[PDB]
């Protein structure tokens, strides 16, 4: 379809702006707003799990593991 940004048009027909591609608000049906672009994967509210994964900081040291390397809930972190 016709769009103004003319960037990364997903299967839903919406042109994913390069910023939108890293906006963190996944918009298209495909998780295309979080792919192949530069972004601060952790904000000031977010925790860097040891392998480079990023997740809600509240998940750190909560008694219940979350990120795929377990870094949010490894006893070494708590």
What is the contact surface with Ca ion in residues (CB under 5 A)? 20, 23, 25, 27, 33, 59, 62, 64, 66, 72-73
* Closer residue to Ca ion, CB minimum distance, 29 or 52: 29
SS3 42: coil
Please report how close the Cβ of residue 44 comes to Ca ion at its closest, in angstroms: 19
Structure tokens at 12: 């839903």
Residue whose entry in the numeric block shows the structure tokens 């952790």: 42
Please report how close the Cβ of residue 67 comes to Ca ion at its closest, in angstroms: 8
Residue whose entry in the numeric block shows the structure tokens 């003319």: 6
Closest CA to 29 of 17, 41, 18, 13: 13
* Closer residue to Ca ion, CB minimum distance, 46 or 73: 73
* Closer residue to Ca ion, CB minimum distance, 46 or 66: 66
Residue whose entry in the numeric block shows the structure tokens 């904000």: 43
Please report how close the Cβ of residue 15 comes to Ca ion at its closest, in angstroms: 11
């Amino acid at each position: 379809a016709k769009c103004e940004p003319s960037q990364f048009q997903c299967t839903n027909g919406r042109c994913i702006t390069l910023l939108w591609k890293c906006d963190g608000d996944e918009d298209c049906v495909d998780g295309s707003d979080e792919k192949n672009c530069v972004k601060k994967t952790c904000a000031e509210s977010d925790f860097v799990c040891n392998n480079g994964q990023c997740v809600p900081s509240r998940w750190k040291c909560d008694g219940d593991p979350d990120c795929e390397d377990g870094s949010d809930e490894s006893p070494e972190q708590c």
